[PDB]
Each structure stands twice: as C-alpha cells, then as structure tokens.
C-alpha cells in the first residue's frame, strides 16, 4: 500500500504548495495568522448559523431520498416520464448520485441526482468564504483579492445548478452529432438537481491510462488532441481542464464525452498568435517571433527578452511538431521541467484569450504523457490551429 501512501505524500506537500502560493500572492499573510484576524473580524452570531447547514450532508444516500428530490426537481409523475428506474446508484458525482435508468422513449438514459443538503450547505459555504475575502481586503495591506469572489460564486452555481452544465452539453451535442470520431450523449431533460442525458459506455480513458493496449493509447490520445483544436473553430467553445473521467473510447473507435461543466468560451476561435508563433519558434525564425509575442501577450512589453528563455518557454509546443508522429511520454515531460538557467520574461498575465487555450493544451499534454500515446500533432495543427500552417 506504499505507493499510495506516496500518493497521499504527494497530494498533501502539493496543496501545503498552493497554500504557500495563496499567502505570497493572495492574502500578503500566512493562513495560521489570517484565521486569527478572521476569528475576531467576523461575528460569532454567523459562525454556526452557517454550521448548521453542513450537518445534513450514510454515505451513499438511501432511495427514499432518491425518490424525495426527484419530487421536488421532476415533480409529482416523475415515473410517467421514465419507463423504469434503477434506485441502485452505478456511480458518485462530487455531490449526488449517478442512477441508470430508461426513459419513456425507450432509450437508456443517465440521471444524476444532487443530495438534498448541498445546496445550503455549499452555498453557506460561499458566503463564509466570501466574507472572509473581505476581511483579507480591509484588513491585510498589499493583498491581491481581484475576482476570487468572481470565481467562487461562478464555480459554486455550476455545481448547483445543473442546467448551466447541461445548457453546456446541449451546444456540443450540436456541433457533434452524428460526427465521425467523437459521441456527445443528449440530454433529455435538466433541472437544478437533475440532470438526465443518453448512457453510453466504453473503455473509460483511466483505464487505457493504467493497462490499455499500444493502438488504444494512441487512438483515444488522438481524438483528444483534435477535440482540443476543433471545438473552438467550429462550436466557438473549449472544453475545459480535462479529467480522464470526461473521455472514453467507444468500440467502434469514437471518443465519448460526457462531462461538459467545465466549457470556456472562445467566440472568435482559436487565436492566431499561438500557432503563428509555434511557426516561427520551429523556424527560428527569432527576427519575427518577438515582435510577435510582445504583439500577442506572451512576453512583456519593454522589457529585454533571452532567446534561450524562449526556447525553454516554448519547447512543450514546439518539440511534438517538429516530427509527423510525436510519442507523448512521461519522460519527455521530465525532460521538459529542466532549465538550462540557473539563479523573469514571461508574461504572469496573459490576455484571456490566450491564457484559456495555453491552460488547456498544457492539461491535454500531460494527459497525452500519461497515456504514453503516439499522436500526430503536426498534421492536426496544420488543419485546425489558425497561423500554424505556412502560408
Ligand atoms: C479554460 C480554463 C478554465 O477557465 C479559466 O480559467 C478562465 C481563464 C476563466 O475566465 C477568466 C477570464 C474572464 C474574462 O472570463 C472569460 C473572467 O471574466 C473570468 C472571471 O475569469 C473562466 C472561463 C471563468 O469563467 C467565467 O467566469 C465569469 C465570472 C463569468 C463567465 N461567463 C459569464 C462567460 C465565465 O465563463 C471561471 C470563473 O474560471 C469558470 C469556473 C467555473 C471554472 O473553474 C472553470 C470551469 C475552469 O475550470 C475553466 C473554464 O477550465
């Protein structure tokens, strides 16, 4: 059990990292001293108001319960619209159930159910955090709070209410219906609490990732480097930070996808900057590739640039298509954590349409490592990333 206990050692000194990152760059305060300023700032008269609401949420909820909220999201004839319903969960959600069921079209249909006290129990848990920004703001000199409110209340809703995520799948069950390499279940129906949508199942992208065949890794790898480019040009859309939970392959070779509460929005497409710069990194072609990036965002206006920083800041895009087919590896993601300088011009604050896509891509590549897949990244750039291909 000792690689797991590694696991645990990894997880614990890699949040401790974040939090370390949270006092230098967030609350100009240690976490030990903020939740002092916070214990006497904030009243005693809203410490446990808010407690008792995290005391509802055994750890699989009971059928009767099951039946309850779907009363209240489905109504009174929930079961008219169904044609039988599985009260067994086959899975978790972060905060609810996954039940199988059949529709009353007859189609087999997922439903996810929500616990009854997590709505009040996570959005309590907002306004304590957001009261505690306050305090951070107010109280702590020098500290950079911009959006984290913004965000809290963005990330909170969209893991309460459930048609935000499923108003999300509707617009790529559009753009990818009936589409030759990638399945984008429908859903059938979308309340705050549940949400139900058409079961597919395949081999699940965890599982290629632990003990898939060489072609599995490689195909499954592929349809997720393309998914990364072509729904941005075509849906206007990118799917988000991607989990190994989100994909999986379907036997007839397409990739599924099911989880879409992530979506970021890219109206205009993908950028050209990116791949116009990836062109001219390849070529060397330094003359025109600074300009470019002090154009774009990517370095700092005004400020004296290293080739050799540029080189290391662009070698995780540049090195997989400077062959036709690139093998994604573990070690090449080692190789790419190592500095050739030895103790900034980078930009720590990319325009948004730059920073969203480079987030992306960089999680789509660790993913590719992992599955240790062989992927054509070169061809599909050429199609599908604006500026990449010479004109
Ligand atoms: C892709 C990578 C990730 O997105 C980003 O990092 C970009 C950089 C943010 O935009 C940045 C940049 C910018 C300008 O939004 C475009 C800014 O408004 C927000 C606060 O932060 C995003 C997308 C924000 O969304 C936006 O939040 C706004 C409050 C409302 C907006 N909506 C009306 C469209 C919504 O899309 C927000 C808060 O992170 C969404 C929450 C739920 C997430 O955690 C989502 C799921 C992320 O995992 C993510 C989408 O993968």
Redesign the pocket.
Known sequence: SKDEVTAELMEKAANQLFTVLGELKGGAMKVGQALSVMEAAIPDEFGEPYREALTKLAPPLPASKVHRVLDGQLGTKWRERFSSFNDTPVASASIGQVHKAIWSDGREVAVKIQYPGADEALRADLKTMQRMVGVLKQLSPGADVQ?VV??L???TE?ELDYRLEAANQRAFAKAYHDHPRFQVPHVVASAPKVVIQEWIEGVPMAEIIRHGTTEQRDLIGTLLAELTFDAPRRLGL?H??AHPGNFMLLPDGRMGIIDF?????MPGGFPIELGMTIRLAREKNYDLLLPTMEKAGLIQRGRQVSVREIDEMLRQYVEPIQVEVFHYTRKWLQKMTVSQIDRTARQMDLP?KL??PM??IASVGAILCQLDAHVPIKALSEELIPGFAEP
């Open positions: 959006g913004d965000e209340v963005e990330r969209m990118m988000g930070d509460g992530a979506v970021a929005p948004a920073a969203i987030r992306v």
